[PDB]
Amino acid sequence: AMGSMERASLIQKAKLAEQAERYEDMAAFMKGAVEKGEELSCEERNLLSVAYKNVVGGQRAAWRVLSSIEQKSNKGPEVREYREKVETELQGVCDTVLGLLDSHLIKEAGDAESRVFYLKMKGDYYRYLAEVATGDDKKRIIDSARSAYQEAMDISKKEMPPTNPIRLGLALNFSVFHYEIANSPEEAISLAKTTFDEAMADLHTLSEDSYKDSTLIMQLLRDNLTLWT
Amino acid sequence: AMGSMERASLIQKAKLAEQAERYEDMAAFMKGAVEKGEELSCEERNLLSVAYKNVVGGQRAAWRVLSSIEQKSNKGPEVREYREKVETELQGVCDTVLGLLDSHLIKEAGDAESRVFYLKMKGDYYRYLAEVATGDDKKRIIDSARSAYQEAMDISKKEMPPTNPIRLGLALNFSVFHYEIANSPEEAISLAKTTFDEAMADLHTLSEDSYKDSTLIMQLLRDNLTLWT
Numbered sequence: 150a151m152g153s154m155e156r157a158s159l160i161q162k163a164k165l166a167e168q169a170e171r172y173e174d175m176a177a178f179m180k181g182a183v184e185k186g187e188e189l190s191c192e193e194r195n196l197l198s199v200a201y202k203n204v205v206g207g208q209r210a211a212w213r214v215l216s217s218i219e220q221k222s223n224k225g226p227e228v229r230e231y232r233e234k235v236e237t238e239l240q241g242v243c244d245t246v247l248g249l250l251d252s253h254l255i256k257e258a259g260d261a262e263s264r265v266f267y268l269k270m271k272g273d274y275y276r277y278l279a280e281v282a283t284g285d286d287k288k289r290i291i292d293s294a295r296s297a298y299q300e301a302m303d304i305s306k307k308e309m310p311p312t313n314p315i316r317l318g319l320a321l322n323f324s325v326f327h328y329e330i331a332n333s334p335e336e337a338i339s340l341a342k343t344t345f346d347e348a349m350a351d352l353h354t355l356s357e358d359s360y361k362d363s364t365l366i367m368q369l370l371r372d373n374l375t376l377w378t
Numbered sequence: 379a380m381g382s383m384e385r386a387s388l389i390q391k392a393k394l395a396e397q398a399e400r401y402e403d404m405a406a407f408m409k410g411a412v413e414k415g416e417e418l419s420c421e422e423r424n425l426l427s428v429a430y431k432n433v434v435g436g437q438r439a440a441w442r443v444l445s446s447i448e449q450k451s452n453k454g455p456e457v458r459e460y461r462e463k464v465e466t467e468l469q470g471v472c473d474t475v476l477g478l479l480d481s482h483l484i485k486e487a488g489d490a491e492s493r494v495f496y497l498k499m500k501g502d503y504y505r506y507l508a509e510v511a512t513g514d515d516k517k518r519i520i521d522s523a524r525s526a527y528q529e530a531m532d533i534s535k536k537e538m539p540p541t542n543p544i545r546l547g548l549a550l551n552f553s554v555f556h557y558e559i560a561n562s563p564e565e566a567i568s569l570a571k572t573t574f575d576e577a578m579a580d581l582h583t584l585s586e587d588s589y590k591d592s593t594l595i596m597q598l599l600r601d602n603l604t605l606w607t
């Protein structure tokens with residue numbers, strides 16, 4: 150439905166929707182902006198990520214509540230029906246995001262900051278699909294997440310400093326993938342610890358403001374290391 | 379869309395949606411339950427009110443953010459367009475609730491607790507329509523709210539004790555109508571003070587649990603009196 154609205158107007162309205170905490174509207178505005186076909190700036194990529202992370206975050210929290218109730222019941226079919234409703238809507242949001250990345254955000258992303266950002270997003274949305282998947286459809290979804298994260302890591306290590314916040318956040322989320330999805334707690338701890346230590350050694354190169362940006366994410370790595378060790 | 383689902387299943391799913399904080403789904407489930415045509419029990423009326431109050435509360439908060447931004451701008455048409463979008467969706471939610479009350483909740487409500495509950499709801503949803511109305515369409519909406527609240531007050535004073543929580547909450551919201559909508563701060567303060575004092579004198583009749591229920595709402599009356607005097 151956003152075909153008739155100006156790209157600039159879509160971006161302006163996404164920012165208004167963020168201020169209003171209207172994240173479903175924010176995501177529809179930013180989907181419309183992506184579908185204009187032009188590449189996104191750094192600000193715009195962040196608007197797209199904030200919108201969908203808040204939409205899928207609501208869905209994941211609801212799915213977890215319903216799944217817990219369903220497991221405790223294991224009356225009639227209603228808890229399973231409603232958990233399946235919420236699950237299908239969550240899957241649809243992830244498939245929307247993955248579709249924007251495949252048509253055609255990733256293929257036109259040539260700079261490291263854009264290409265790593267999009268491949269991290271592809272890892273994250275396959276990861277949310279894996280959280281609700283079962284069996285051996287689940288295996289192929291987990292491998293799709295792994296592959297996207299790994300391509301993003303390879304580029305980030307070649308092209309960005311170890312304190313770059315997108316590099317840091319990629320490594321944080323890939324560590325969470327290993328601990329929560331891939332049953333690989335030692336890989337998770339290794340990655341979080343190596344990433345924290347390599348960033349610490351590069352902090353001296355940063356301005357006050359960059360230092361604030363990087364140490365924020367480093368603290369998240371440390372918080373996880375504390376939960377996991 | 380809820381015509382094929384059992385009434386009991388709709389109520390069960392509304393309670394699951396409340397636990398999941400999925401208030402739009404909760405409201406659609408309870409609209410479906412109302413549209414079965416049977417009267418609602420006390421528990422069910424509370425589920426219907428909780429669902430819509432959370433849906434319209436999100437819309438009112440967003441509308442206030444957008445309206446404030448629009449007033450500060452007074453660029454191009456986008457802030458007005460998006461405030462109008464949110465306003466129209468808010469109006470639609472209120473028109474849905476008012477339609478359920480008119481078809482046919484109020485006309486079949488013969489007991490005081492049900493009839494006062496529904497007429498309070500009719501007052502509240504016309505009040506939310508008045509918050510976004512302008513001019514002299516606004517006057518007729520304000521009079522619709524007034525009339526519903528007044529019918530509810532007349533029945534509550536004849537039929538319920540002064541500590542009854544629905545009577546208390548009606549009086550609290552009618553006081554807010556007078557202060558925020560009708561430009562009648564003295565009527566608001568008079569009503570809140572008379573309602574608080576009449577409840578205080580009846581507390582001695584209550585059990586521990588009823589006393590907790592009533593004094594909760596009395597504290598809201600006192601909190602408003604503090605803001606207004």
Ligand SMILES: O=C(COc1ccccc1P(=O)(O)O)Nc1ccccc1C(F)(F)F
Pocket residue numbers: 205206207209210273321322325
């Ligand atoms: O509690 C968490 C913490 O998750 C992470 C921690 C570190 C890095 C990435 C993530 P990710 O799994 O990408 O969010 N997430 C969550 C789970 C369910 C619902 C809503 C949310 C949210 F709102 F995001 F918090």
Ligand SMILES: O=C(COc1ccccc1P(=O)(O)O)Nc1ccccc1C(F)(F)F
Pocket residue numbers: 434435436438439502550551554
């Ligand atoms: O801040 C308030 C306090 O309003 C009242 C106080 C006393 C009696 C009735 C109300 P009412 O005006 O019926 O809610 N409401 C509000 C306003 C905007 C958005 C969301 C909300 C909500 F979530 F309800 F808090």
Ligand SMILES: [Cl-]
Pocket residue numbers: 230231234391
């Ligand atoms: Cl369902």
Ligand SMILES: [Cl-]
Pocket residue numbers: 256257258259
């Ligand atoms: Cl390219």
Ligand SMILES: [Cl-]
Pocket residue numbers: 374375376377378
């Ligand atoms: Cl620990």
Ligand SMILES: [Cl-]
Pocket residue numbers: 162459460463
């Ligand atoms: Cl709009």
Ligand SMILES: [Cl-]
Pocket residue numbers: 485486487488
């Ligand atoms: Cl009747």
Ligand SMILES: [Cl-]
Pocket residue numbers: 603604605606607
């Ligand atoms: Cl005061």
Ligand SMILES: [Mg+2]
Pocket residue numbers: 155156
């Ligand atoms: Mg154009």
Ligand SMILES: [Mg+2]
Pocket residue numbers: 188257258259260
């Ligand atoms: Mg390019």
Ligand SMILES: [Mg+2]
Pocket residue numbers: 384385
């Ligand atoms: Mg039946």
Ligand SMILES: [Mg+2]
Pocket residue numbers: 417486487488489
């Ligand atoms: Mg009846």
